[PDB]
Every structure is written in C-alpha cells, then in structure tokens.
Design an enzyme around this catalytic site. Structure first.
Site, PDB file in Angstrom:
ATOM      1  N   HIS A  15       0.842  -1.187   0.000  1.00 21.87           N
ATOM      2  CA  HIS A  15       0.000   0.000   0.000  1.00 21.87           C
ATOM      3  C   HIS A  15       0.883   1.245   0.000  1.00 21.87           C
ATOM      4  CE1 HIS A  15      -2.818   3.086   1.393  1.00 21.87           C
ATOM      5  NE2 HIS A  15      -3.801   2.271   1.055  1.00 21.87           N
ATOM      6  N   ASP A  17       0.749   4.195   1.246  1.00 27.90           N
ATOM      7  CA  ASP A  17       0.969   4.782   2.564  1.00 27.90           C
ATOM      8  C   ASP A  17       1.955   3.954   3.377  1.00 27.90           C
ATOM      9  OD1 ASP A  17      -0.687   7.002   2.226  1.00 27.90           O
ATOM     10  OD2 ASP A  17      -2.474   5.912   2.887  1.00 27.90           O
ATOM     11  N   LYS A  18       1.829   2.626   3.322  1.00 28.45           N
ATOM     12  CA  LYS A  18       2.701   1.771   4.120  1.00 28.45           C
ATOM     13  C   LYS A  18       4.101   1.682   3.530  1.00 28.45           C
ATOM     14  CE  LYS A  18       0.799   0.809   7.852  1.00 28.45           C
ATOM     15  NZ  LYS A  18       2.103   1.120   8.503  1.00 28.45           N
ATOM     16  N   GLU A  43      10.184  12.112   6.562  1.00 31.83           N
ATOM     17  CA  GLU A  43       8.923  11.855   5.884  1.00 31.83           C
ATOM     18  C   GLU A  43       9.188  11.327   4.479  1.00 31.83           C
ATOM     19  OE1 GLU A  43       6.485  12.274   7.879  1.00 31.83           O
ATOM     20  OE2 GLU A  43       6.949  13.932   9.234  1.00 31.83           O
ATOM     21  N   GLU A  56      14.279  16.244   8.526  1.00 34.37           N
ATOM     22  CA  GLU A  56      15.409  16.782   9.274  1.00 34.37           C
ATOM     23  C   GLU A  56      16.150  15.638   9.950  1.00 34.37           C
ATOM     24  OE1 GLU A  56      12.121  17.688  10.304  1.00 34.37           O
ATOM     25  OE2 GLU A  56      12.034  19.029   8.569  1.00 34.37           O
ATOM     26  N   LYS A 164      -5.304  -4.817   1.057  1.00 33.46           N
ATOM     27  CA  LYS A 164      -6.104  -4.176   2.096  1.00 33.46           C
ATOM     28  C   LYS A 164      -7.115  -5.180   2.631  1.00 33.46           C
ATOM     29  CE  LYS A 164      -7.653   0.042   1.689  1.00 33.46           C
ATOM     30  NZ  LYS A 164      -8.422   1.307   1.535  1.00 33.46           N
ATOM     31  N   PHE A 233      -6.936  -6.479 -10.132  1.00 35.57           N
ATOM     32  CA  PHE A 233      -6.050  -5.684  -9.292  1.00 35.57           C
ATOM     33  C   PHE A 233      -4.617  -6.009  -9.711  1.00 35.57           C
ATOM     34  CE2 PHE A 233      -5.237  -4.327  -4.581  1.00 35.57           C
ATOM     35  CZ  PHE A 233      -4.445  -3.298  -5.047  1.00 35.57           C
ATOM     36  N   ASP A 241      -1.247   6.548  -7.939  1.00 37.82           N
ATOM     37  CA  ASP A 241      -1.712   6.730  -6.573  1.00 37.82           C
ATOM     38  C   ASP A 241      -0.733   7.651  -5.855  1.00 37.82           C
ATOM     39  OD1 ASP A 241      -3.318   6.503  -4.366  1.00 37.82           O
ATOM     40  OD2 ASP A 241      -3.245   4.310  -4.267  1.00 37.82           O
ATOM     41  N   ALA A 242      -1.012   7.919  -4.581  1.00 36.26           N
ATOM     42  CA  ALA A 242      -0.153   8.782  -3.782  1.00 36.26           C
ATOM     43  C   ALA A 242      -0.186   8.320  -2.334  1.00 36.26           C
ATOM     44  CB  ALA A 242      -0.588  10.246  -3.885  1.00 36.26           C
ATOM     45  N   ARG A 247      -0.021   8.112   7.332  1.00 36.04           N
ATOM     46  CA  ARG A 247      -1.414   8.207   6.920  1.00 36.04           C
ATOM     47  C   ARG A 247      -2.209   6.952   7.261  1.00 36.04           C
ATOM     48  NH1 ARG A 247      -2.929  12.470   3.260  1.00 36.04           N
ATOM     49  NH2 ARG A 247      -4.880  11.280   3.061  1.00 36.04           N
ATOM     50  N   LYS A 248      -1.634   6.049   8.051  1.00 38.86           N
ATOM     51  CA  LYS A 248      -2.289   4.831   8.516  1.00 38.86           C
ATOM     52  C   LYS A 248      -2.076   4.661  10.015  1.00 38.86           C
ATOM     53  CE  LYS A 248      -4.206   3.305   4.798  1.00 38.86           C
ATOM     54  NZ  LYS A 248      -4.358   4.752   4.483  1.00 38.86           N
ATOM     55  N   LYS A 268      10.533   8.660  12.971  1.00 41.51           N
ATOM     56  CA  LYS A 268      10.835   9.471  14.142  1.00 41.51           C
ATOM     57  C   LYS A 268      11.649   8.650  15.130  1.00 41.51           C
ATOM     58  CE  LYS A 268       6.452  11.970  13.685  1.00 41.51           C
ATOM     59  NZ  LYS A 268       5.333  12.599  14.437  1.00 41.51           N
ATOM     60  N   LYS A 272      11.167  11.658  19.883  1.00 36.58           N
ATOM     61  CA  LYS A 272       9.837  12.119  19.500  1.00 36.58           C
ATOM     62  C   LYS A 272       8.810  11.396  20.362  1.00 36.58           C
ATOM     63  CE  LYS A 272      12.099  14.034  16.012  1.00 36.58           C
ATOM     64  NZ  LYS A 272      13.586  14.096  15.941  1.00 36.58           N
ATOM     65  N   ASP A 274       5.781  11.400  20.309  1.00 39.26           N
ATOM     66  CA  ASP A 274       4.717  10.788  19.519  1.00 39.26           C
ATOM     67  C   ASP A 274       4.900   9.279  19.428  1.00 39.26           C
ATOM     68  OD1 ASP A 274       2.990  12.855  18.952  1.00 39.26           O
ATOM     69  OD2 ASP A 274       4.011  13.444  17.098  1.00 39.26           O
TER      70      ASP A 274
HETATM   71  C1  LIG Z   1       8.700  19.794  17.207  1.00 40.61           C
HETATM   72  S1  LIG Z   1       8.311  19.660  15.445  1.00 40.61           S
HETATM   73  C2  LIG Z   1       8.561  17.885  15.199  1.00 40.61           C
HETATM   74  C3  LIG Z   1      10.047  17.565  15.159  1.00 40.61           C
HETATM   75  C4  LIG Z   1      10.783  18.315  14.055  1.00 40.61           C
HETATM   76  N1  LIG Z   1      10.062  18.195  12.786  1.00 40.61           N
HETATM   77  C5  LIG Z   1      12.221  17.812  13.958  1.00 40.61           C
HETATM   78  O1  LIG Z   1      12.928  18.117  12.997  1.00 40.61           O
HETATM   79  O2  LIG Z   1      12.710  17.092  14.833  1.00 40.61           O
HETATM   80  C6  LIG Z   1       6.506  19.748  15.469  1.00 40.61           C
HETATM   81  C7  LIG Z   1       5.964  21.173  15.438  1.00 40.61           C
HETATM   82  O3  LIG Z   1       6.506  21.953  16.487  1.00 40.61           O
HETATM   83  C8  LIG Z   1       6.555  23.317  16.113  1.00 40.61           C
HETATM   84  N2  LIG Z   1       7.879  23.888  16.421  1.00 40.61           N
HETATM   85  C9  LIG Z   1       8.921  23.994  15.536  1.00 40.61           C
HETATM   86  N3  LIG Z   1       9.968  24.570  16.166  1.00 40.61           N
HETATM   87  C10 LIG Z   1       9.612  24.834  17.442  1.00 40.61           C
HETATM   88  C11 LIG Z   1      10.302  25.411  18.500  1.00 40.61           C
HETATM   89  N4  LIG Z   1      11.559  25.817  18.336  1.00 40.61           N
HETATM   90  N5  LIG Z   1       9.675  25.561  19.719  1.00 40.61           N
HETATM   91  C12 LIG Z   1       8.371  25.135  19.878  1.00 40.61           C
HETATM   92  N6  LIG Z   1       7.691  24.562  18.822  1.00 40.61           N
HETATM   93  C13 LIG Z   1       8.299  24.413  17.619  1.00 40.61           C
HETATM   94  C14 LIG Z   1       6.363  23.367  14.606  1.00 40.61           C
HETATM   95  O4  LIG Z   1       5.150  24.019  14.313  1.00 40.61           O
HETATM   96  C15 LIG Z   1       6.287  21.923  14.157  1.00 40.61           C
HETATM   97  O5  LIG Z   1       5.268  21.747  13.203  1.00 40.61           O
END
Ligand SMILES: C[S@@+](CC[C@H](N)C(=O)[O-])C[C@H]1O[C@@H](n2cnc3c(N)ncnc32)[C@H](O)[C@@H]1O
Ligand SMILES: Cc1nc(NCC2CC2)nc2c1COC[C@@]21CCN(Cc2ccccc2F)C1
Lengths: 378, 373
Positions: A15, A17-18, A43, A56, A164, A233, A241-242, A247-248, A268, A272, A274
C-alpha cells in the site's frame, strides 16, 4: 440487545501509505546502526515512479539514501513495470536537512531530557485476545501478514505486495468489557499478476489465508466474504496513486478502538514523544490487563516541548476494575517513570528495530519490549 | 483527596495555519475548492508536501476545470502569512512542484467497508469538548492579533494544548477548571521572552478562556522551548492529513482513520464523517442527549448504512433503539443523499482545513436538524 458491530482495517506492505512508513523507518534504522543518538524526522512521499524523502536529520552516520530506499522497495517486492513499480528504475529524491537548531536547544542529563514536542498519546489494552488487542485489528493484521508470507515463499506466486483487509466482528457488552461473538464480514483485496483467474484467487484467499488465520469458532455459515471485490487488481503500489508517511496511524495502533492523539510513528527517533510515549502508554495498559488489574483500560499522557515530566496522566478502565481510577493511577506512578529519557532506557529504544514496526501493527507482537508486561508492585 | 477520587484530566491540542501540516491541509483543500468552482463534479485526491522552500502537489484529479496551481498555492501561502525569507518561507519565491495526474472526464454504494463516528457533548455551546474548543480558539486569537498588527512580532506557525479538569455528571462530563495551557508560536528576532509570555497570558489566553475556568493553580507553559524563530516548513516537514485528531474531536469520541483535506465529497470517509457529526449534534441540541457517540457502519456496495449504534452514556431519557428509530426517521445517511442534503458540491472546504472541521456554525453539518418524533 446490547450487541454492536465493529470494523478494523489493515493494509499490506505494498500500500503506498505503508511503503512510505517502512522506507521512513528503514532510513531511521540505517542511522541508528551507526549513530544510536541520531535525531531523525524523515517523511516519505510515494507516487508514480517516485520516492521523495523530506525532513530533518542530525546524525554522525554516513547513509546511502539511494540504496536504503531501493533495498526497502526491493524487500517490499516491487521489481518490475508489470507490478507498477520497480526499485531498479524508480526516481529517488532526497530533501533532508539538519534538525532545527531552535528545536535542538529547546546540554542536560539523561534522566530529565525535555520532550522534543508537545502532544497527547493514548494507550489501550483489552483481554479479548491473548495479545491484549481488539480481535478486529489482530485478525486484519494477521491476514495481510499471511498474504505476504504466502507471496514470499512462492506457494501463492501470483500475489503482489499491495493489499487491504477489513474485518467486521459482532461484539457483546458486559460491564465495560467486550466479548467477540462472531466474525460478521471479511474483505480482502490484494494485488495479483495477469495470469491467475478471479475464481482461483477467491478460493485460495478463503482456504489458504482466512481459514489459516481466523479461528473456526468465529466463522459460521452467515459470515460474509468479500474477496477481491473490485475485480482485477493487476497494478498497485504508488502507480497512479499517492502515499504519505503517517497516513495509517489507526492501522498502526488499535484499529479504531481506544483513542488516538494524532501523532505518527514511522521516521521518528525515540526523542519524538509521539512514538516513545505511545509505546510506553501501550506498555502501561498491557501491564495493567496482564497483571489482572483490569479487563480493558485506556491511558492518556501529554507533554510540552522541553519539559521532561508528563503534563497529564489519565486512566479509564471502562468499569472493568474493582479498583477506582485514581488508585490505578497511583499504581502506574509507582511502577512507571513516563519521562522520555527514562522510557528510552526502559524500553531500549535506541536499537534499529523500527522497520519491523512499520507494517502489521506496532502493538500486539511479542517481539517488542513495550509488549512485555511489567511485573507490578503495589 | 475527595477531589482526586472523583476527577480526571483530559488533554487536546491544536495548531495554527502556519504549522507545516496545516499548510498542506489548507493548500490541498484550496486545490479542491479551485476545481469545484469550475467543475462541481470534479474528483480530487490532492496531497501536499511542505519543506524548506518547497510545496509539492501529488495525487489524482478527474476534472473539467483549468486550475492555475501557481496562483492557488502562492495565494494560500500569502494568506497564511509567509511572505519573506526572514520568516523562513516566501510565497513569491518558493518552489511549487506539480506532480498531479489530471484526467478529463442517490444509490451510490459505499466504496469501503468502513466505520464513521459522530460525537457531541453539551459541555460547550458548539457541542464539542472544551479541550479542543479552547485549543482551537487560542490559535485563532494568535492569527487575529498577528494580522491586525496588535502583536506584530507573531508569525504564522503555532501550536496549543489544553488540559481540562473534569467531573463526571450522570454519564455526561462537566468541565471544572483548566489544568494546564501550552502555547508555542513562531516569533521574530527582536521581541523578548517576558514580553511574549505576558501577551500570551493577558491578550490571548484571558481573551479566549472564560475566567471561571482559570485560577491560581492553572499551569502555564508559554513558549516553553525558549526560542521559536525557525518555523513553518523550514523547521519541520509537513504533509496533508497529519492532524486528523486536531481536525475532529481532540481525542474524544472515536476516529476511523481517514483524513479530510484534499478529498472531494464522493469520498465517504469525509462526507459521511460530516453527516455522523450532524446526527450527534442534532441529538444533543434537540435535548435527546447530553453526550453521544454515533457509530455508522457501511457495507461495501450497499448505500444505506449496514448498522448504526448510539452510545448516549446513559444521558438520554430514551433507549438506544428509541434513539435509533428517531435517527432513521430524521436522517438519510446514504452517501449520495448526504451530499445533496448538506450541499457538499460547494467550494466550502478551505475554511475547514484549519481550526477544526467540527464546532463552527458556518458549516452545513454544524446546523442541527430539528427532530420530528
Ligand atoms: C517539534 S516539530 C517535530 C520535530 C521536528 N520536525 C524535527 O525536525 O525534529 C513539530 C511542530 O513543532 C513546532 N515547532 C517547531 N519549532 C519549534 C520550536 N523551536 N519551539 C516550539 N515549537 C516548535 C512546529 O510548528 C512543528 O510543526
Ligand atoms: C472517570 C473517567 N476518567 C477518565 N480519564 C480520562 C482518560 C483515559 C483517557 N475518562 C472518563 C471517565 C468517565 O467518564 C467518561 C470518560 C471520558 C473519557 N472516556 C474515555 C474515552 C472514550 C472515548 C475516547 C477517549 C476517551 F478517553 C471515558
């Protein structure tokens, strides 16, 4: 009546996305192999004949992104135009910079490193399976895993990477707990070559895949099977597709059960929250159910960028626990340290283990530390 | 301790228009609105990707319209407020890459065996959780003070997070106080930290959060990273559909998995999601419930919902089967009918791509239907 239907979705490695999820975690693992302290936020975009990496990275590793991506696409199985994608001839674009220095600054010890971002994360567990996961998403995941397994061992050679699955289970309520009664509907769509005929595919999907994954006590005479419902299929993946990384996320977690805070996992590193806090929240929820304290529990944590201690911690046991929620909260606070610098140590999150998580679910598989319950003390 | 035993916390977040993920949602729906203006039957699946100096459009479009993507993208970025390299992004000079595959061209069945969730709660006037409502309006107030010159040091990228202390009330939830507020907003290189943090408390928070919810124990994390000069796509790559919980209920209710922006109304997981919210809000506003989750199941190929569950948490004087009979007497939840009843072929979607899809009066699914029974 007290009976409801619930459906969970899962997609295969092919897929679009995957594909992006697995490539992003393949880039993460590559850096972690050389630099365990690498900062990665990679990403991935996949469309017709293109893989694009944007994000980054701060790492001492020397990574060949061209070969990391093409080996991932090769592993997924796209090696010819007849399948819609080929790792040998696809376009790979790289737009990776260094992590923001404002972000990096916001120099300190290991135990109280601040969270790399704000956000809320959820953890969930339910005793309806021994994996402590909802039966709908477990079945959906294992069905896609069986397809890839039979594709890769050559026993179903007409299979292709994109797929799927959707599983609908009829549930019964019982004082906050959920009892799976039967499988209501199974939907399976999988990419295939041009030679195999439609009827042969549908029978193989039932006898070799469904019957090999779904326990017989959940299938009956009224179960609906929607096998290859869109007809042919032959071409899938990024062609026409994109796909995008992250996105999952409902597929990646609990398939619609519990709750979700919105953060994506793949690409990540452990700083992170998340990812690391979501893994830890699952760790807490599973340890509460496996320890006999509840049958079904939801956990929420939240953070602020630069702050180490969680901003809020909440438990909800759906009424499946004799103990109140506040004392469940204290049992957690006495057994778990939910600071991001301690989670990485406790869950060993610096290992290059993340490409394995990018498909068939991050939760419910014993191969991962956040799936090993913690012996609780109180 | 008496308070600790009968109280829980809940946290939701939101982001501003300059957040890189929301930039993509905004551009993806601006592309959708552009096609819908000329071709109301356009099929759109537009993904946007944002990084340093780059906006990338990818996906599939089947439409009769001729859309100037350079103008649509650059005017959306201009509207967001990125107009100079000193802010990390400039609509005049950024690279716009168009990778769309455009093709020139009710009993509509469901294309997926999916679950749609609608949610509503009487804790706020907009029938939404206070956590996500406050988080949304805090970002909006930032953009308001930035655009009218009140706080000229502000920049488009921002994030907010609100934790509310709740009490249960007969199945309904009741906000007691705001436990914690987090605000991070991009800023210029001259304004100082103390000045920023005071304006965020005095001119932003107190102008948005009711005073009865704020006390002396409320915790404030204002500009917690200490320095937010680099932002937008430069500081973080952004993708369409990476804020689906911000877009919906901030963690409350439930979510099936599909994103909203970039998809036209024939995508069930967008149009039916709107209709599910429409049903739940009508139940609460009609006094049938104080808090409800509408769970709609669609069988593949079939137009009518295969099953509808109503979870009122015991806040309804009627039973679930009674509530269900009221819903089916007052709602036609078939996808093709939903589009007509909600007038979904209008170019109304760019407004949804920020500050939440649910909880604002200016949307057809947010106008509660008066129920006959
Ligand atoms: C913390 S970033 C996610 C990690 C980041 N993309 C990285 O390169 O590691 C998520 C969101 O935090 C916000 N953000 C970016 N720089 C920030 C900063 N210096 N202090 C607080 N929030 C920030 C931005 O809007 C961004 O979309
Ligand atoms: C006593 C209590 N505590 C909490 N602790 C907050 C938490 C665990 C995350 N939540 C709740 C209650 C009792 O009242 C109703 C809910 C409110 C929240 N609900 C749980 C829920 C349902 C659906 C989606 C997300 C959710 F968190 C149960």
């Amino acid at each position: 009546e007290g009976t409801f239907l619930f459906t969970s979705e899962s997609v295969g490695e092919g897929h679009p996305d995957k594909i992006c999820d697995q490539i992003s975690d393949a880039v993460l693992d590559a850096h972690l192999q050389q630099d365990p302290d690498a900062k990665v936020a990679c990403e991935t975009v996949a469309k017709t004949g293109m893989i694009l990496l944007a994000g980054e990275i701060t790492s001492r590793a020397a990574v060949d992104y061209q070969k990391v991506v093409r080996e991932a696409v090769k592993h997924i199985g796209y090696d010819d135009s007849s399948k819609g994608f080929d790792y040998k001839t696809c376009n790979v674009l790289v737009a990776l910079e260094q992590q923001s220095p404002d972000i990096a600054q916001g120099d300190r010890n290991e135990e109280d490193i601040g969270a790399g971002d704000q956000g809320l994360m959820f953890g969930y567990a339910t005793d309806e399976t021994e994996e402590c996961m909802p039966l709908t998403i477990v079945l959906a995941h294992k069905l896609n895993a069986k397809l890839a397994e039979l594709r890769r061992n050559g026993t179903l050679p007409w299979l292709r990477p994109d797929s799927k699955t959707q599983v609908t289970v009829q549930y019964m309520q019982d004082r906050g707990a959920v009892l799976p009664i039967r499988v209501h509907t199974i939907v399976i769509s999988v990419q295939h070559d041009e030679e195999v005929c439609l009827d042969e595919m549908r029978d193989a999907l039932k006898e070799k895949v469904i019957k090999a994954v779904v326990p017989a006590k959940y299938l009956d005479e009224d179960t609906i099977y929607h096998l290859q419902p869109s007809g042919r299929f032959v071409i899938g993946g990024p062609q026409g597709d994109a796909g995008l990384t992250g996105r999952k996320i409902i597929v990646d977690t609990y398939g619609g059960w519990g709750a979700h805070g919105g953060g994506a996992f793949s690409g990540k590193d452990y700083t992170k929250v998340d990812r690391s806090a979501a893994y830890a929240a699952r760790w807490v929820a599973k340890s509460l159910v496996k320890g006999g304290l509840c049958r079904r529990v939801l956990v929420q944590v939240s953070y602020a960028i630069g702050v180490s201690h969680p901003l809020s911690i909440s438990i909800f046991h759906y009424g499946t626990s004799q103990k109140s929620e506040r004392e469940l909260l204290e049992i957690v606070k006495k057994n778990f340290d939910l600071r991001p610098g301690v989670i990485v140590r406790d869950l060993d999150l610096k290992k290059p283990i993340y490409q394995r998580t990018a498909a068939y679910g991050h939760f419910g598989r014993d191969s991962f530390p956040w799936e090993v319950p913690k012996k609780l003390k109180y």
